[PDB]
Ligand binder design. Structure first.
Ligand SMILES: NC(=[NH2+])NCCC[C@H](N)C(=O)O
Ligand SMILES: [Zn+2]
Ligand SMILES: [Zn+2]
Length: 622
């Protein structure tokens, strides 16, 4: 997509060349307004609103609106009108740059969900005595004025060497009025964007505040106001009229303010760079202010929490698969009770990136240690334990990464009287420690990177539960296979953790107390192909369905952003409660003690959820 400000440059060129000399009662003005609406119409319900003042005098202003859940919109006003006594002559410095940056911001916010709506307003006939802004405020009713979260104004975004962003003249009463001024100062400081403010040297104007722009009408209410202009308050009468210390001339007039003249005197690189800086700065300000960044961060946090729960369930399903391999081994050559029968080994797993489902493209890989041991008399029932370690570095998108060491303790008892029928049981306990590193990559459709922040966090989550399986089967030849039924239960608990990073996008999680009840039914296989003097392969595969009787995994979490702290409901999507998983592989025995394996587990659902996974490990039975 287009970089930061390139689209602003394109729309500036179109505005200044195709429709120069835009003023009230002009066909060029109508063409310019049509162009203005056409530029920012992406993702907006643009609707020009004609107004009148003093009878015959009338004009119109472009309004682009984005629906907001909170019902309080933020207004980005910037007129596209030139001086009245300047017909058919391009006005660049006056507000062409402002209009270009405004359309740039409107497009960069297009297609983005916003908790607070954005109402990009392109004013007109402003040079005629602020008619557009006053008429817009007049059209506002009590509800709109109550819901005016704030106002941002643009004007003369090129000529001024040092850019400024000063709040309204009403900042003297409420010290908190200049909230937008403070936010834009913070963003400019954090993005290496030089942005001063009003020095307040002149007593005629309030310190840190501007005047004589669109927000003169918005000052009527105690709402944040932000004038964004490029001037030079340390030069001339300290009122910004001499906006540039360069030779140049300086304001809107026929004799100056032309594309070629500005390019020759101030350099095209300067105008382009200032337009890019304004685009990026205001895009970040609108993101942080309309809480669109908070909405994106909460959406990414919901995705991260869902993926963390999926990682925990994947780890415990890997533990149960290890138990299943041990049971496969145990179902043959029962051997005398007692003696030495402990087992140990390392197991690894590679998860293909084809799982998808979760928004982060979950490419994962598992590895770790595990222990085993089991003996009991009568050779029918044998109960034993296991001590497992696992570190599944489930990797998100845009550099996101989740990883956690895990300790697992299980007690399982396998019962078989030597016949076709068998049954068993199982329990588990897991004390993992996630090191969350998620990414919040928010960008417009075809637009540049609006914001790319990486959060970090540390959480410990416990998990317990129970399990049991069994069945019976016949066999043709040396290989057996038949129906197996099982019950899986795990009451995961993910403790609340707050992100270490101090940003707006950092989140504050909550305790997750949810249970998964995977009732199952399927078919299994088990055989022995003893090719070689010591090798005895154990083919085995499964095709079993699962139907949850409960939530399975938490759907919606109450999250609060560190920037604001309000209660935000984040949706992690639906929970696939109707699917089935399949297994495949075999187990080798290099000797009586050593033995490798290669199991592939592949959850399959026809509607949504097709996770896949491979695994290879070696057991030293000693
Ligand atoms: N001292 C100032 N605030 N000067 C800037 C005035 C800009 C003027 N309202 C315009 O739109 O062209
Ligand atoms: Zn002007
Ligand atoms: Zn202006």
């Amino acid at each position: 997509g287009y970089q930061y400000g390139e689209y602003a440059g394109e729309t500036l060129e179109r505005l200044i060349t195709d429709y120069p000399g835009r003023y009230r009662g002009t066909a060029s003005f109508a063409g310019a307004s049509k162009l203005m609406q056409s530029r920012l119409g992406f993702g907006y319900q643009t609707s020009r609103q004609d107004f009148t003042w003093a009878g015959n005098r009338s004009s119109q202003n472009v309004i682009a609106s984005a629906p907001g859940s909170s019902g309080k919109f933020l207004v980005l006003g910037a007129h596209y009108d030139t001086y009245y006594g300047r017909p058919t002559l391009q006005g660049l410095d006056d507000n062409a740059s402002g209009a270009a940056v405004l359309t740039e911001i409107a497009r960069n916010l297009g297609g983005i969900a916003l908790e607070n709506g954005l109402e990009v307003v392109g004013f007109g006939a402003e040079e005629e005595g602020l008619r557009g802004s006053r008429a817009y405020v007049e059209s506002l009713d009590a509800s709109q004025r109550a819901n005016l979260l704030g106002m941002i104004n643009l004007d003369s975004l090129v000529t001024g060497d040092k850019m400024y962003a000063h709040a309204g003249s009403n900042s003297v009463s409420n010290p908190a009025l200049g909230a937008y001024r403070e936010q834009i100062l913070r963003i400019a400081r954090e993005l290496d964007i030089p942005l001063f403010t009003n020095p307040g040297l002149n007593a005629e104007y309030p310190a840190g505040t501007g005047c004589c722009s669109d927000g003169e009408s918005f000052n009527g209410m105690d709402i944040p106001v932000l004038f964004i202009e490029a001037t030079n308050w340390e030069l001339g009468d300290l009122d910004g009229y001499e906006q540039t210390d360069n030779p140049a001339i300086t304001w809107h007039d026929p004799a100056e303010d032309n594309k070629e003249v500005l390019t020759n005197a101030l350099g095209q690189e300067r105008i382009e760079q200032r337009m890019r800086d304004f685009s990026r700065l205001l895009t970040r300000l609108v993101l942080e202010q309309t809480n669109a960044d908070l909405l994106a961060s909460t959406a990414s946090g919901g995705a991260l929490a869902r993926q963390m729960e999926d990682q925990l369930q994947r780890q415990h399903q890997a533990l149960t698969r290890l138990h299943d391999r041990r049971w496969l081994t145990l179902l043959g050559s029962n051997r005398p009770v007692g003696s030495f029968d402990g087992e140990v080994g390392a197991e690894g797993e590679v998860s293909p990136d084809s799982g998808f489902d979760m928004p982060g493209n979950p490419e994962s890989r598992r590895a770790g240690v595990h222990l085993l041991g089991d003996y009991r008399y009568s050779e029918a029932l044998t109960l034993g334990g296991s001590l497992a370690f696992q570190r599944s570095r489930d990797k998100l998108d845009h550099g996101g990464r989740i990883e956690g060491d895990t300790w697992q303790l299980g007690l399982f008892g396998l019962y078989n009287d030597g016949g076709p029928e068998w049954l068993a049981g199982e329990l588990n306990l897991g004390h993992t420690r996630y090191d969350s590193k998620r990414s919040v990559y928010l960008q417009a459709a075809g637009g540049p990177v609006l914001l790319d922040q990486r959060l970090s966090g540390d959480t410990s989550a416990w998990s317990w539960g129970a399990r049991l399986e069994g069945g019976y089967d016949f066999s043709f030849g040396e290989l057996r296979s038949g129906p197996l039924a099982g019950l899986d239960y795990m009451h995961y608990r993910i403790d609340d953790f707050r992100e270490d990073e101090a940003l707006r996008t950092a989140l504050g999680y909550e305790k997750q107390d949810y249970d998964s009840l995977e009732a199952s039914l399927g078919w299994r296989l088990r055989g022995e192909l003893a090719l070689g003097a010591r090798m005895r392969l154990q083919p085995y595969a499964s095709l079993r369905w699962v139907r949850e009787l409960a939530d399975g995994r938490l759907d919606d979490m109450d999250l609060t952003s560190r920037g604001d702290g309000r209660v935000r409901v984040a949706d992690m999507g639906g929970v696939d409660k109707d699917f089935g998983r399949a297994q495949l592989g075999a187990q080798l025995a290099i000797t009586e003690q050593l033995g490798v394996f290669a199991e592939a587990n592949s959850r399959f659902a026809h509607s949504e959820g097709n996770q896949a996974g491979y695994s290879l490990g070696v057991n030293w039975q000693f």
